[PDB]
Amino acid sequence: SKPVVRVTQGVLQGSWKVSTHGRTYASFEGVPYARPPVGKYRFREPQHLKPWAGVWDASKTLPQCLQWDPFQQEVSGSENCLYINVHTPKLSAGASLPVVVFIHGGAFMYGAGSLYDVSHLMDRDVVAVTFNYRLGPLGFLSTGDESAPGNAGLKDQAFALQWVKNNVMMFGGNPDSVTLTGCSAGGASVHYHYLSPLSKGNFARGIAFSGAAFASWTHAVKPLQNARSLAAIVGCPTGTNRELVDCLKYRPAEVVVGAQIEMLEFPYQQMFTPFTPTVEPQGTRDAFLTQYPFLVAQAGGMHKVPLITSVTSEEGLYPAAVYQKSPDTLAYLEANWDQLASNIFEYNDTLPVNQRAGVAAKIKQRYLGNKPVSQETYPQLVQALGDRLFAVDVGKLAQIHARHSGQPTYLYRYSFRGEKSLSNMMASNDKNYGVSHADDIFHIFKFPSLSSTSSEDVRMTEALIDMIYSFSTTGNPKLTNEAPVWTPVTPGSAELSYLEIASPSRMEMKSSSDFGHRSFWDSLGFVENENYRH
Ligand SMILES: *[C@@H]1O[C@H](CO)[C@@H](O[C@@H]2O[C@H](CO)[C@@H](O[C@@H]3O[C@H](CO)[C@@H](O)[C@H](O[C@H]4O[C@H](CO)[C@@H](O)[C@H](O)[C@@H]4O[C@H]4O[C@H](CO)[C@@H](O)[C@H](O)[C@@H]4O)[C@@H]3O)[C@H](O)[C@H]2NC(C)=O)[C@H](O)[C@H]1NC(C)=O
């Protein structure tokens, strides 16, 4: 007899699944949490879902949000994609389990909640929650005015957190013990939820894996320039912002999503998108965010709940791993370094054009010693990209939360290299380039063909899940009993305490005065964070 739950909008029938270690759990997939954002509701904030008649089939995951998938080089999914997936080993309203919510990555351009299998997590007494939010121009169009204020896809997320608060009890989750977690755009997304009034009081604690809302690729400074370009590529007449959004509302969703890749200086190898979170205009009704993330954070405006944030030793394998796919790509980066530095390091909009030559030469000086880009300099290219894109702003996230929150704030550096890496998928080889962006996450979740059953990988899976469970219950994150105590970041210290996770059996407390080599990246004159003005 298949598992059944009533939620606010009606009755769900799910499936019975098995955890990694042979335990039964209830799985409810393809649960709608919002009206389909279709027709006049393309680009608009999520609308309330009208209750459904009869029993809704929650046995299968439903379509991912319509997206440019750069790995498959196609448009895939559907406009009808606002689906949540809820997994419980205790299907009982009185179970009151910690709730682990996961916001997927994909640079706000691609991905899906349904790619992340919760088999490992279901060997613990938590409810796991994955979900879809609108992506690319569908999720993040902005004309910088009431026509398209921006952040639709973050409003989808907030709406999903609101849905979890109102409905997770029926799956045996404690709404008052939600652990909000995410990776890449999802980690940035967790940080965005700390900053927004919309998500205040809707999570007890956070984990931002390899992502912060302070990172340039997570934030659009010139949305109206992006919207006009998209509209022009698609043959929409330029005139009023009203006419622009109206023409985009009536073009096929597939034409609007696919067109983004044809924009001028579109991210090299399509690993990021200009359709990202932005600052919504002043006086926007129920805005997600009306001020630049750094100014909200430094005013102490982040929600006062604990935080784990984290990076891997070779973060830059996103995107640098895709550079190994074609053997011509490193030679192309060498030949065109001066034009493409502002691209791959994502300061297209936050540095004057006349300053690009200068900054390009400083980056090549600092990390490559001015050597040509090649297989020999690949590791330094990876460190450079990982520092700029992920590690620096993860360090600022940890420090600024530790500084303002009055709450335990933890940092980890993951340097365990297991059987498999995300580099395998992105490079299409089995070469070891170190520990990629998301190689820790691929131990918590099963991602298609990036799951291992080696003894050492299985132990890391247990350790990282013990980190989430211990953080969600006691509040003191602990991977193993033998590990030295994980110390929080000291409020107001120039020094950042982090757990260095070399392996499941080897981790110790370390310290950086210059996390991600911030002193270098802060000195290049990017109009970001400490240097931001209107
Ligand atoms: C990265 O940063 C760089 C540096 O700022 C950005 O580069 C700017 O890119 C924009 C285009 O996105 C470009 O703007 C064009 O400038 C020209 C000035 O000579 C204009 O001719 C051109 O106008 C057309 O396009 C507009 C929309 O982009 C329309 O609103 C306008 O009506 C024009 O439309 C005509 O032409 C189109 C085809 O182009 C046609 O289909 C229409 O029907 C119509 O006939 C733009 O305004 C800037 O010049 C660039 N600046 C520099 C210095 O290079 C870049 O956009 C950023 N990229 C990302 C991804 O963020």
Side-chain angles (χ1 to χ4, degrees):
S1 164
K2 286 173 67 170
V4 169
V5 175
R6 190 174 276 284
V7 295
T8 306
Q9 289 83 210
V11 184
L12 300 171
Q13 194 179 280
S15 57
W16 293 116
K17 308 274 195 64
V18 187
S19 70
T20 298
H21 297 315
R23 187 203 211 195
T24 285
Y25 72 99
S27 181
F28 299 91
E29 300 168 315
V31 182
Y33 75 84
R35 182 181 184 163
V38 183
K40 72 184 208 166
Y41 293 113
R42 183 188 294 174
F43 303 128
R44 275 195 55 190
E45 77 286 350
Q47 304 297 307
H48 278 289
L49 176 57
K50 190 200 147 179
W52 65 76
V55 182
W56 185 285
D57 178 17
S59 66
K60 297 195 267 271
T61 64
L62 295 187
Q64 52 175 35
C65 286
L66 196 74
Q67 68 186 242
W68 178 257
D69 177 342
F71 295 113
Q72 301 287 5
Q73 281 298 290
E74 73 188 358
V75 174
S76 68
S78 162
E79 281 203 280
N80 186 7
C81 65
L82 295 185
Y83 296 115
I84 192 153
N85 320 285
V86 185
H87 315 267
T88 181
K90 301 247 189 268
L91 187 42
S92 162
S96 200
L97 299 193
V99 186
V100 176
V101 178
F102 180 71
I103 308 169
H104 69 78
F108 299 103
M109 183 167 53
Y110 66 90
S114 50
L115 289 177
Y116 301 82
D117 166 324
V118 301
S119 296
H120 308 326
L121 282 172
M122 291 292 92
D123 287 318
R124 298 286 185 282
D125 297 358
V126 305
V127 181
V129 173
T130 73
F131 68 103
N132 300 338
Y133 56 87
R134 282 171 285 170
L135 301 162
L138 295 189
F140 297 104
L141 188 72
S142 176
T143 54
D145 76 12
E146 63 164 356
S147 283
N151 293 333
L154 279 175
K155 287 178 191 151
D156 293 345
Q157 294 181 19
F159 215 69
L161 278 181
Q162 198 58 239
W163 185 99
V164 163
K165 175 199 159 96
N166 298 325
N167 293 290
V168 76
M169 177 157 56
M170 304 295 86
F171 303 83
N174 180 2
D176 281 324
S177 190
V178 171
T179 303
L180 188 55
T181 76
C183 198
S184 164
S189 287
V190 165
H191 190 189
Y192 272 123
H193 288 295
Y194 273 94
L195 295 161
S196 173
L198 290 193
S199 297
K200 180 185 187 172
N202 289 350
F203 57 106
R205 57 194 83 84
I207 310 181
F209 296 102
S210 304
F214 300 149
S216 54
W217 59 267
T218 83
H219 197 82
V221 178
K222 304 185 192 180
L224 181 49
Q225 158 177 78
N226 293 332
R228 282 170 171 176
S229 164
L230 187 60
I233 288 158
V234 149
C236 287
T238 42
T240 64
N241 293 345
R242 197 171 167 180
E243 284 171 3
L244 185 164
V245 172
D246 199 73
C247 180
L248 286 176
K249 265 179 161 72
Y250 278 93
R251 292 292 206 263
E254 290 84 359
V255 170
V256 173
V257 165
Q260 74 185 287
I261 73 170
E262 293 171 46
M263 295 166 82
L264 189 60
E265 304 200 65
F266 193 87
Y268 182 69
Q269 296 293 339
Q270 302 175 343
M271 289 298 106
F272 299 98
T273 179
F275 296 107
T276 58
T278 198
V279 172
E280 301 177 60
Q282 217 65 10
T284 301
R285 192 169 138 91
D286 299 320
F288 186 92
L289 188 72
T290 54
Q291 173 71 294
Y292 185 66
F294 195 79
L295 303 195
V296 175
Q298 277 292 55
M302 283 171 68
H303 305 322
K304 300 183 196 291
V305 303
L307 173 63
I308 297 164
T309 185
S310 67
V311 290
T312 66
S313 45
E314 286 75 37
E315 277 291 357
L317 289 163
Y318 201 97
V322 75
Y323 301 166
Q324 291 286 3
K325 200 173 163 39
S326 161
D328 277 308
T329 295
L330 284 187
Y332 185 93
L333 270 162
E334 170 52 22
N336 305 115
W337 180 266
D338 271 1
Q339 284 73 237
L340 267 122
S342 57
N343 191 304
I344 67 177
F345 296 113
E346 290 273 319
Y347 52 94
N348 190 69
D349 314 316
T350 56
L351 190 77
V353 169
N354 43 296
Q355 296 195 25
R356 282 182 178 179
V359 170
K362 290 182 184 201
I363 295 169
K364 209 162 183 191
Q365 177 56 255
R366 187 49 157 70
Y367 279 90
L368 275 66
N370 227 52
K371 280 195 275 286
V373 175
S374 76
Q375 291 296 337
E376 264 197 51
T377 58
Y378 188 66
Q380 293 86 27
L381 183 53
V382 164
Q383 284 310 300
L385 284 163
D387 288 344
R388 161 57 177 179
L389 295 176
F390 301 109
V392 167
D393 294 316
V394 165
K396 293 187 181 186
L397 171 51
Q399 202 181 67
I400 291 173
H401 197 64
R403 168 180 302 149
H404 285 108
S405 72
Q407 291 297 317
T409 304
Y410 299 83
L411 184 60
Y412 79 75
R413 194 165 169 282
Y414 179 94
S415 56
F416 172 60
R417 179 46 155 89
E419 192 197 10
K420 295 177 180 196
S421 175
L422 174 66
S423 77
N424 300 155
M425 188 258 211
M426 295 178 64
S428 300
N429 65 27
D430 44 19
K431 303 259 113 185
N432 180 13
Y433 301 119
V435 184
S436 177
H437 179 84
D439 281 354
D440 51 345
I441 247 58
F442 292 152
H443 285 96
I444 297 166
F445 305 94
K446 300 186 64 176
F447 190 89
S449 60
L450 287 188
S451 186
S452 179
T453 62
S454 296
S455 93
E456 195 79 333
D457 280 288
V458 167
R459 282 169 92 245
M460 187 49 82
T461 287
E462 286 291 316
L464 286 178
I465 283 162
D466 284 345
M467 169 173 78
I468 297 172
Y469 193 67
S470 57
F471 184 58
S472 300
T473 59
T474 63
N476 307 314
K478 195 191 306 192
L479 281 79
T480 77
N481 300 345
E482 305 88 32
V485 163
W486 191 351
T487 283
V489 168
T490 302
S493 169
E495 220 68 22
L496 291 186
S497 276
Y498 69 93
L499 191 67
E500 180 71 52
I501 307 159
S503 84
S505 57
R506 277 155 20 97
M507 53 201 87
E508 51 179 317
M509 286 310 300
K510 296 229 252 165
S511 216
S512 192
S513 34
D514 198 31
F515 201 80
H517 300 103
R518 168 189 315 175
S519 54
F520 172 73
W521 293 98
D522 282 350
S523 77
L524 299 183
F526 302 142
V527 185
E528 297 166 10
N529 301 326
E530 290 86 355
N531 278 9
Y532 177 89
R533 291 180 210 85
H534 302 93

Coordinates of all heavy atoms in Angstrom, one line a residue, residues 222 225-226 228-239 263-267 273-274 348-349 353 356, ligand 1:
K222 N 23.9 45.2 -14.1 CA 23.3 45.8 -15.2 C 22.3 44.9 -15.9 O 22.3 44.5 -17.0 CB 24.4 46.2 -16.3 CG 25.5 47.0 -15.7 CD 26.5 47.4 -16.7 CE 27.8 48.0 -16.1 NZ 28.8 48.5 -17.1
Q225 N 20.6 46.0 -19.3 CA 21.5 45.8 -20.5 C 21.3 44.4 -20.9 O 21.3 44.1 -22.2 CB 22.9 46.1 -20.1 CG 23.9 45.5 -21.0 CD 25.3 45.9 -20.7 OE1 26.0 45.4 -19.7 NE2 25.9 46.8 -21.5
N226 N 21.2 43.4 -20.0 CA 21.1 42.0 -20.3 C 19.7 41.7 -20.9 O 19.6 41.0 -21.9 CB 21.3 41.1 -19.0 CG 22.7 41.2 -18.5 OD1 23.7 41.4 -19.3 ND2 22.9 41.0 -17.2
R228 N 17.6 43.9 -22.5 CA 17.6 44.5 -23.9 C 18.3 43.7 -24.9 O 17.8 43.6 -26.0 CB 18.2 45.9 -23.8 CG 17.2 47.0 -23.2 CD 17.9 48.3 -23.0 NE 16.9 49.3 -22.6 CZ 17.2 50.5 -22.2 NH1 18.4 50.9 -22.2 NH2 16.2 51.3 -21.9
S229 N 19.4 43.1 -24.5 CA 20.3 42.3 -25.4 C 19.5 41.0 -25.8 O 19.4 40.7 -27.0 CB 21.6 41.9 -24.8 OG 22.2 40.8 -25.4
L230 N 18.9 40.3 -24.8 CA 18.1 39.1 -24.9 C 16.9 39.4 -25.9 O 16.8 38.6 -26.8 CB 17.6 38.6 -23.6 CG 16.8 37.3 -23.5 CD1 17.7 36.2 -24.0 CD2 16.2 37.0 -22.2
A231 N 16.2 40.5 -25.6 CA 15.0 40.9 -26.4 C 15.4 41.2 -27.9 O 14.7 40.8 -28.8 CB 14.4 42.1 -25.8
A232 N 16.6 41.8 -28.1 CA 17.1 42.1 -29.5 C 17.5 40.8 -30.2 O 17.1 40.6 -31.3 CB 18.3 43.0 -29.4
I233 N 18.2 39.9 -29.5 CA 18.6 38.6 -30.1 C 17.4 37.9 -30.7 O 17.5 37.2 -31.7 CB 19.4 37.7 -29.1 CG1 20.8 38.3 -28.9 CG2 19.5 36.3 -29.5 CD1 21.4 37.9 -27.5
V234 N 16.2 38.0 -30.0 CA 15.0 37.3 -30.2 C 14.1 38.1 -31.2 O 13.0 37.6 -31.5 CB 14.4 37.0 -28.8 CG1 12.8 36.9 -28.8 CG2 14.9 35.7 -28.2
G235 N 14.5 39.3 -31.6 CA 13.8 40.1 -32.6 C 12.7 40.9 -32.0 O 11.9 41.4 -32.8
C236 N 12.7 41.1 -30.7 CA 11.7 42.0 -30.0 C 12.1 43.4 -30.2 O 13.2 43.8 -30.2 CB 11.7 41.7 -28.5 SG 10.8 40.2 -28.2
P237 N 11.1 44.3 -30.5 CA 11.4 45.7 -30.8 C 11.8 46.3 -29.5 O 11.3 46.0 -28.4 CB 10.0 46.3 -31.3 CG 9.0 45.4 -30.6 CD 9.6 44.0 -30.5
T238 N 12.9 47.2 -29.5 CA 13.3 47.9 -28.3 C 12.5 49.2 -28.4 O 12.2 49.8 -29.5 CB 14.8 48.1 -28.2 OG1 15.3 48.4 -29.5 CG2 15.5 46.9 -27.6
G239 N 12.0 49.6 -27.2 CA 11.2 50.7 -26.8 C 11.0 50.8 -25.3 O 12.1 50.7 -24.7
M263 N 24.4 36.3 -26.4 CA 24.7 37.6 -25.9 C 26.2 37.9 -26.0 O 27.0 37.0 -26.1 CB 24.3 37.7 -24.4 CG 22.8 37.6 -24.2 SD 22.3 37.3 -22.5 CE 22.3 39.0 -21.9
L264 N 26.6 39.2 -26.1 CA 28.0 39.7 -26.3 C 28.8 39.3 -25.0 O 28.3 39.7 -23.9 CB 28.0 41.2 -26.6 CG 29.4 41.7 -27.0 CD1 29.9 41.0 -28.3 CD2 29.3 43.2 -27.3
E265 N 29.9 38.6 -25.1 CA 30.8 38.2 -24.0 C 30.0 37.3 -23.1 O 30.1 37.5 -21.8 CB 31.4 39.3 -23.3 CG 32.2 40.3 -24.2 CD 33.2 41.1 -23.4 OE1 34.2 40.5 -22.8 OE2 33.1 42.3 -23.4
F266 N 29.1 36.5 -23.6 CA 28.4 35.4 -22.7 C 29.5 34.6 -22.1 O 30.5 34.4 -22.7 CB 27.4 34.6 -23.6 CG 26.5 33.8 -22.7 CD1 25.3 34.3 -22.3 CD2 26.9 32.5 -22.3 CE1 24.5 33.5 -21.5 CE2 26.0 31.7 -21.5 CZ 24.8 32.3 -21.1
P267 N 29.4 34.2 -20.8 CA 30.4 33.4 -20.1 C 31.0 32.3 -21.0 O 30.3 31.6 -21.7 CB 29.6 32.8 -19.0 CG 28.6 33.9 -18.6 CD 28.2 34.5 -19.9
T273 N 25.9 32.5 -16.1 CA 24.8 33.2 -16.9 C 24.8 34.6 -16.3 O 24.9 34.9 -15.1 CB 23.5 32.6 -16.8 OG1 22.5 33.4 -17.5 CG2 23.0 32.3 -15.4
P274 N 24.5 35.6 -17.2 CA 24.1 37.0 -16.7 C 22.7 37.1 -16.1 O 22.5 38.1 -15.5 CB 24.2 37.8 -18.0 CG 23.9 36.9 -19.1 CD 24.4 35.5 -18.7
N348 N 33.0 41.0 -15.8 CA 32.5 41.6 -17.0 C 31.9 43.0 -16.8 O 32.0 43.9 -17.6 CB 31.6 40.8 -17.8 CG 31.3 41.3 -19.2 OD1 32.2 41.3 -20.0 ND2 30.1 41.9 -19.4
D349 N 31.2 43.2 -15.6 CA 30.3 44.3 -15.4 C 30.8 45.2 -14.2 O 30.2 46.3 -14.0 CB 28.9 43.9 -15.1 CG 28.4 42.8 -16.1 OD1 28.6 43.0 -17.3 OD2 27.8 41.9 -15.6
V353 N 36.2 48.8 -18.9 CA 36.8 48.1 -20.0 C 38.3 48.5 -20.1 O 39.1 47.6 -20.3 CB 36.0 48.4 -21.3 CG1 36.8 47.9 -22.6 CG2 34.6 47.7 -21.3
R356 N 40.9 46.4 -18.2 CA 40.9 45.0 -18.4 C 42.3 44.5 -18.6 O 42.7 43.5 -17.9 CB 39.9 44.5 -19.5 CG 38.5 44.5 -19.1 CD 37.5 44.1 -20.2 NE 36.1 44.0 -19.7 CZ 35.1 43.7 -20.4 NH1 35.2 43.3 -21.7 NH2 33.9 43.7 -19.8
Ligands
LIG1 C1 29.8 42.4 -20.7 O1 30.3 43.8 -20.6 C2 30.4 44.4 -21.9 C3 31.0 45.8 -21.6 O2 30.1 46.7 -21.1 C4 29.0 44.6 -22.5 O3 29.2 45.1 -23.8 C5 28.1 45.9 -24.2 O4 27.2 45.1 -24.9 C6 26.0 45.8 -25.4 C7 25.1 44.7 -26.0 O5 24.7 43.8 -25.0 C8 26.5 46.8 -26.5 O6 25.3 47.6 -26.8 C9 25.2 47.9 -28.1 O7 25.9 49.1 -28.4 C10 25.8 49.5 -29.8 C11 26.4 50.9 -29.8 O8 27.1 51.2 -31.0 C12 24.3 49.5 -30.3 O9 24.3 49.5 -31.8 C13 23.5 48.3 -29.9 O10 22.1 48.7 -30.0 C14 21.3 47.5 -30.5 O11 21.0 46.5 -29.4 C15 20.3 47.0 -28.3 C16 20.2 45.9 -27.3 O12 21.5 45.3 -27.1 C17 18.9 47.5 -28.8 O13 18.2 48.0 -27.6 C18 19.1 48.6 -29.8 O14 17.8 49.0 -30.3 C19 19.9 48.1 -30.9 O15 19.2 47.1 -31.6 C20 19.5 47.1 -33.0 O16 20.5 46.1 -33.3 C21 20.1 44.8 -32.9 C22 21.3 43.9 -33.1 O17 22.4 44.3 -32.3 C23 18.9 44.4 -33.8 O18 18.6 43.0 -33.5 C24 17.8 45.3 -33.4 O19 16.6 45.0 -34.1 C25 18.2 46.7 -33.7 O20 18.4 47.0 -35.1 C26 23.7 48.0 -28.4 O21 23.2 49.0 -27.6 C27 27.6 47.7 -25.9 O22 28.1 48.5 -26.9 C28 28.7 46.9 -25.3 N1 29.8 47.7 -24.8 C29 31.0 47.5 -25.1 C30 32.0 48.6 -24.7 O23 31.4 46.5 -25.7 C31 28.3 43.2 -22.5 O24 26.9 43.3 -22.9 C32 28.4 42.4 -21.2 N2 27.9 41.1 -21.4 C33 27.3 40.4 -20.4 C34 26.9 39.0 -20.8 O25 27.0 40.9 -19.4

